[PDB]
Amino acid sequence: GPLGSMENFQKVEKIGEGTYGVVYKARNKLTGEVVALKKIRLSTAIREISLLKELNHPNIVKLLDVIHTENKLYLVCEFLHQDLKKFMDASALTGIPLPLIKSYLFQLLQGLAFCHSHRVLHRDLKPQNLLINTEGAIKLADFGLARAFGVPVRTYTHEVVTLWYRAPEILLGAKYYSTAVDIWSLGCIFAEMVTRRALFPGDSEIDQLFRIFRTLGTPDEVVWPGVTSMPDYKPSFPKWARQDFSKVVPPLDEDGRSLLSQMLHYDPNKRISAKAALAHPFFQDVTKPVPHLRL
Ligand SMILES: CCC(=O)N1CCN(CC)c2cc(C(=O)OC)ccc21
Known part of the structure; x- marks a missing residue:
């Protein structure tokens, strides 16, 4: 199982909750970028999700990356206020x-x-x-x-x-x-x-x-x-x-x-x-x- 691929992110505050995930405002400790991070604790989902990474539209929130770690899936998204x-x-x-x-x-x-x-x-x-x-x-x-x-x-x-x-x-x-x-x-x-x-x-x-x-x-x-x-x-x-x-x-x-x-x-x-x-x-x-x- 993978580890460490999230150390670059600092949680700033919680901004949402769903049946299957929690969403945080987060600051990339390295980039300085402010992102929204969906944390899903744990296939066909990987291909379906990674396909959403290509659906780029000015009226669709940009999905930046998908990070699988320690039986947790992270979705990294552009942040809106x-x-x-x-x-x-x-x-x-x-x-x-x-x-x-x-x-x-x-x-x-x-x-x-x-x-x-x-x-x-x-x-x-x-x-x-x-x-x-x-x-x-x-x-x-x-x-x-x-x-x-x-x-x-x-x-x-x-x-x-x-x-x-x-x-x-x-x-x-x-x-x-x-x-x-x-x-x-x-x-x-x-x-x-x-x-x-x-x-x-x-x-x-x-x-x-x-x-x-x-x-x-x-x-x-x-x-x-x-x-x-x-x-x-x-x-x-x-x-x-x-x-x-x-x-x-x-x-x-x-x-x-x-x-x-x-x-x-x-x-x-x-x-x-x-x-x-x-x-x-x-x-x-x-x-x-x-x-x-x-x-
Ligand atoms: C990568 C995170 C994601 O998949 N989503 C859908 C879940 N939510 C709702 C809480 C969300 C909110 C924001 C946002 O900017 O809120 C101010 C950005 C992205 C996302």
Whole structure:
């Protein structure tokens, strides 16, 4: 077993925790570089992860190296100074300005268009893993693997937001997710930036599914062909009627609501793609504003 390959890094503070890893702000004792370090205590993962080292995009957090040591895997990443979750909480009383919301949505759709073109899915987009900098950029981080691994961290306080961004086909037991799962997650994040409240804040898998049903209507073969034969579908689901989007995301203009409605189509095969969404009229006036960041 290897040793010593981490002596060059000085942990500065903890910045995140997940089911299978802990994330630190760290200073390379030699380089002087400040990085983010994910520590996973302990195959197909090595090839899948090392493939993420080549997916380089201005809207994807750069993965710098992958360091295997003493039955611990380290991921070394570029460091950003704030995540969208904290920025959204910092703006809860003022709201994020719409031109900045639009900029952020456009950039993340650019990021997803890139990954999806390379047949990479994120699988777990959440405000907490969208990272922002002072110059107005936002970046995707913490790509979810197809086969999770690593010893679960016993100190992991779970989070209320865990299921809030999960696409309905995942919740209904689809075995093979498509890139449409990421568009759903981003639509949920788009709505939350606009309204300052989570769109579908479910606290169990069935609560998550039912919160979606009460808002968009219980799906049937009319809007989602094949849904009634999905693994976890139950003919005994309650039958809620669809609400109108004017009530779900005020104060979003008609272009925004139109784009959002397409990001939240039940049928993954009808849900808009990242590339098509970039062409939506909502973005004809997109700009790149500066956020006001504290630290
Ligand atoms: C290499 C570490 C990594 O894989 N990830 C995904 C895990 N997290 C979330 C805590 C993360 C945060 C930051 C960051 O700059 O936070 C301010 C940078 C990278 C990562």
